[PDB]
Every structure is written in C-alpha cells, then in structure tokens.
Design a binder for this molecule. Structure first.
Ligand SMILES: [Fe+3]
Length: 294
C-alpha cells in the first residue's frame, strides 16, 4: 500500500516491509549475492579469501535476481506517492557484506543524514519532489548482533540541520548526544526491505558477532526535478562479459522500470525509425511497441 508506506516514511522516516521477497525470488536473490560474498562456515573460503575481496560492489550485478529489485514496481509506486512525481531516477545501487569480528574489526558509522547529492551543489529540501528514498533489502537474518541499520527520525522532526557546523550531514556524538540516546536498531528477517527517506538520521553499525556476515542490497531513488543529482553511473559496452545479463535485464523490464535508468520514455523525440532499429539490434526480443513513433 503506497499510501500506507508513504505515511510511515513521512511521519517516522522509515518503514520495514516484511517478506518483500519470498519463495523462489528470495532463494534466487540469496544465491546471487552469495556468488560475491562467501561464508567460511558453509563453503571452502577462508578469512584470507574474504579479506582479498571488496565488500561493496556497484550495480549492474552478474544476476538479475539482484539487478531487478531496485526497480521493483512496488518500490517505484511508494516513491511516486511520497515525492508526488513519476519522473524518478535510480541514484545508486550496490551490494554489501559486513563480516563478523573473526574477519577483522568492524566499525560503526556516525549518525548522519543522506539528504544531499554527492556534489553538495545546493542545499537539500526534505519536501515533495526533492526527497530521496533509500532501500536496504536484507538477504540474511539481521539481529542486534549482526550489524543492524540504526534509525532515529527525520532530521526536521529532531530539530537538527541537514548541514551541521562541521560542514557535513553527519552528527558527532559530542555535538548531538541526544540523537545517539534516541537511536534504535532495525531487526529484520531475510527478504525484508527497509525503506527510509534520505533526510532521516541513521547509521550503519559494527557487526558484533564473531562469525557470519550480513548480506544486503542497497539502492536509492530521487526525482529528476532535483536536477543537480546524478543517477547511478556505470560503464558497460556490448563487448563486456557482463553485457548479456544487462541486455537480458533491459528486455525483462517494463517501460515504467526502464524510466528510472534514464531510458527515453514513450513519445520522446529520441525515437525514430533508426533508433527503434538499433534498440532491437542491441536488445534482441525487446518489445518496441510502446516506443514506436506514430
Ligand atoms: Fe547513510
């Protein structure tokens, strides 16, 4: 219910959606993220192998059991309801592993907001089409011992500025002790999705357990009206080994989903006989009907 979830986001800054993935969709997403981040308790990897891998990896991924979820139409509908626009873009997406203390020290982030674009070009607004929506799709069970996300509330609800005197969107413990007294962990079963507005005060946390790792898919979405904000940048060409997965994603996605990647919408001046032709060449089997010029 986009109206219900948007109301939770508006009033408390976050909403936890249980069982966002279930059944085969969940098992497939778990298997896909496990191809990147192993588990020495369950496979033949070691702490040395784990330390040699990067623990955060950007979209697009090697499986559409990960690539499709930031573009899920249930998520898009929530964001459209909250922002009041359909002209949305995926700002970023990455997968992440946080390993237990047997694999090295794990440290907490400071409480912060994510209301800002990366360039800080202009100050954020927390209303209307200027809001940002973040998702964390948990692919392992998350307890207080396994690096839960911590949340407080929307910055304005706490009276704290989006730009602090230190010149960032982060809140030090010495300047903002009351925020740390109010923070709470989000505990969640695998397949749950945490949604939050970017102006919420929140943080990642250290993994306190010795063994295991938390696995999650991250993404965030903005309205194109916030035109100083970048959509997710990646580099790929048809020659690349990862192209086939991305090509297959583009064929699978519906027009409403492709829109978040900056795809030219139906009726856009981009579409001509030649660009329809090259679209079918690059994505064989894609449905060109919504884009055909009159
Ligand atoms: Fe953050």
């Amino acid at each position: 219910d986009s109206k219900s979830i948007a109301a939770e986001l508006a009033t408390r800054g976050y909403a936890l959606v249980p069982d966002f993935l279930t059944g085969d969709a969940l098992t497939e997403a778990v298997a896909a993220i496990e191809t990147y981040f192993p588990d020495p308790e369950a496979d033949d990897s070691t702490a040395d192998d784990v330390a040699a891998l990067k623990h955060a990896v950007p979209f697009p991924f090697t499986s559409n059991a990960l690539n499709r979820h930031p573009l899920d139409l249930r998520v898009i509908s929530v964001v459209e309801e909250l922002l009041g626009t359909t002209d949305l873009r995926m700002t970023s997406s990455f997968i992440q592993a946080k390993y237990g203390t047997a694999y090295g020290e794990s440290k907490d982030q400071r409480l912060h907001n994510d209301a800002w674009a990366a360039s800080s070009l202009v100050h954020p607004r927390a209303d209307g089409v200027y809001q940002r929506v973040y998702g964390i799709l948990y692919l392992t069970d998350v307890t207080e011992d396994t690096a839960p996300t911590y949340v407080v509330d929307r910055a304005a609800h706490l009276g704290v500025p989006l730009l602090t005197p230190e010149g960032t969107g982060a809140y030090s413990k010495e300047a903002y002790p009351e925020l740390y007294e109010r923070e709470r962990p989000v505990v969640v079963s695998k397949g749950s999705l945490l949604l939050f507005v970017g102006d919420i005060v929140h943080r990642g946390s250290a993994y306190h357990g010795h063994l295991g790792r938390r696995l999650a898919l991250f993404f965030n979405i903005h309205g194109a009206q916030a035109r100083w904000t970048d959509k997710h940048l990646w580099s790929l060409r048809p020659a690349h080994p990862d192209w086939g997965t991305f090509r297959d994603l583009m064929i699978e996605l519906e027009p409403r989903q492709r829109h978040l990647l900056g795809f030219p919408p139906p009726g856009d001046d981009y579409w001509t006989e030649e660009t329809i032709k090259h679209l079918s060449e690059m994505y064989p089997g894609i449905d060109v009907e919504p884009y055909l010029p009159a």
